[PDB]
A paper describes a structure:
The rCviUPO asymmetric unit reveals a compact dimer through a parallel association of helix α12 from each monomer, providing a closely packed helix interface. The rCviUPO structure includes all amino acid residues, except for the initial Glu1 and the thirty-two C-terminal residues—from Lys228 to Lys259, whose lack is due to their flexible conformation—one heme molecule and one Mg2+ ion. The monomer adopts an α fold formed by twelve helices and two short β strands (E124-V126 and K177-P179). In rCviUPO, the neighbor residues located at the upper side of the cofactor that outline the cavity shell include Leu57, Ile61, His90, Phe88, Gly161, Glu162, and Lys165, with the heme iron coordinated by the thiol side chain of Cys19 at the lower side. The Mg2+-coordinating residues in rCviUPO (at 2.01–2.14 Å) are the same found in rMroUPO, but no acetate was found at the heme pocket. This is in agreement with its absence from the rCviUPO crystallization medium, and resulted in the presence of one water molecule (wat255) near the sixth coordination position of the heme iron. Phe160 of rMroUPO was replaced by Lys165 in rCviUPO and, as a result of this and other amino acid substitutions, the access to the substrate binding site in rCviUPO was narrowed. In the rCviUPO crystal structure, the buried interface area of the dimer, including the two α12 helices, was 1304 Å2. Dominant at the upper side of the interface are Arg156 and Lys224, which establish polar contacts on both sides with residues Glu216 and Glu223, respectively. At the corner of the dimer, Ser54 and Glu56 also bridge the interface by hydrogen bond interactions.
Author numbering:
A (entry chain A): 2 to 227
B (entry chain B): 1 to 227
Amino acid sequence: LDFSKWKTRQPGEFRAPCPAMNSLANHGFIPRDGRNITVAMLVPVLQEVFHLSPELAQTISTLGLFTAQDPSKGVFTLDDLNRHNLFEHDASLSREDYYFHKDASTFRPEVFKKFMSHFKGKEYVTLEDAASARYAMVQESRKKNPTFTYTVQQRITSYGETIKYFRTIVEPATGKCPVAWIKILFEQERLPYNEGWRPPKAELSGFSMASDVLELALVTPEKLID
Amino acid sequence: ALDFSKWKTRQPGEFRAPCPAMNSLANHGFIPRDGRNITVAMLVPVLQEVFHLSPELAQTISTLGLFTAQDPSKGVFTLDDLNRHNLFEHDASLSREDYYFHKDASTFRPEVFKKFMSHFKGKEYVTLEDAASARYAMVQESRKKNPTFTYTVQQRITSYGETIKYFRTIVEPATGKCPVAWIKILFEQERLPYNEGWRPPKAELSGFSMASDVLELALVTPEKLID
Ligand code: HEC
Ligand code: HEC
Ligand SMILES: [Mg+2]
Ligand SMILES: [Mg+2]
């Protein structure tokens, strides 16, 4: 894992709405041009760079394959991940809903500003602030987007994405998530190795995700009952 | 591959847990009948085969079971180890009373289970919403009556997870729906209702799918740690 090979995205290179996957490509940990991705190649990378458990890595990578133009052929691209309402969903943290400009892939400073304002004056992301920030995007989409789609599938991916950054973009010494490293991940699509980040000591598993998603929901004022 | 007709209820000397599924496995002889000499390596394929747990989820829960032994290094645990309060066993159970009251959070309590089952009165099937209400009712009873109520991050995920476990594994092959009558058999007899039509579930219960299910259960539970 040579983190010094990093280059920002170049013309012709496919990129996704994911800052993690986009960082892998920019680091050259997966093909830089965002093409020719297989589950077999991605899974070890996710385990080594982000310390996802084997099964969680296999699961998310396969959900990625399911966005391919032909998932039978076992190959997908970062552009496949941009397909609306397959994996990509409304109420994102740093991207606008597909509805508005038919581009839910391009990083949006004005969306990211809203998200980050939930951590203003803090060096670290707390569970409660991360809950508030994600749910604020749900409320905005619900009030602004007449096509808002937020089913069982989108709910877990949305909750899971907040857990993913909260658990993986952490200080080795503390396990805590610095606001400044989130900023680097989303804005630069660089893993903040230079700033002191390393692959997490703790494994992110399906079970640990389940606990974390529960804890997020218990500090979110979101209910489907009344 | 598996013989479900070998079921016997608990016999003298045999250890049993506060878990109706682990007790059914033993009563069926799918793990050692006496509730002893359980290892992770033995239990994971049984959980995969009988309950369609994912390899990783099965490994994780089996290991949580193992860390209930006084010495996990021995690599072996028993259903009696599972009876140890606030290791895996926890307050606000659906069919057992809190350890506080009589130092017995292992023996099935008709009175507790009566209150659990009251949330499905008039219904053939368990819905996510009624399962959520039945579990939260136990949390509120424990918070109301037990001065030593313990409900930390660890108990919460296991409590939510156990409702999802019966809701997803004790289901009709035809519909994936959870029959009230089958929950009654599992809890009251500690028998998998094979005789009545139950079969290992078609759908796999994985860490990811559990995470979705626990999320959805929480979204229909009036439970928050914020107000
Ligand atoms: C392994 C570590 C990992 C981390 C950390 C991670 N992801 Fe993503 N991720 C996506 C997609 C697609 C989205 C877009 C969802 C959306 O619309 O917000 C996304 C979104 C996100 C978001 C939210 C972005 C936003 O603007 O809301 C975060 C944070 C994130 N991913 C972090 C496909 C993937 C895939 C697919 C193969 C993998 C593997 C994956 N992601 C792995 C990871
Ligand atoms: C694989 C299928 C499986 C199912 C279905 C299952 N369990 Fe349990 N389970 C427990 C323990 C300990 C409890 C007691 C928790 C409590 O205090 O309610 C429990 C409780 C439960 C409960 C709630 C009972 C109540 O009175 O609240 C249900 C339902 C349950 N288990 C179902 C250890 C285990 C272990 C340990 C190795 C395994 C594996 C396990 N359980 C696997 C399973
Ligand atoms: Mg989106
Ligand atoms: Mg208990």
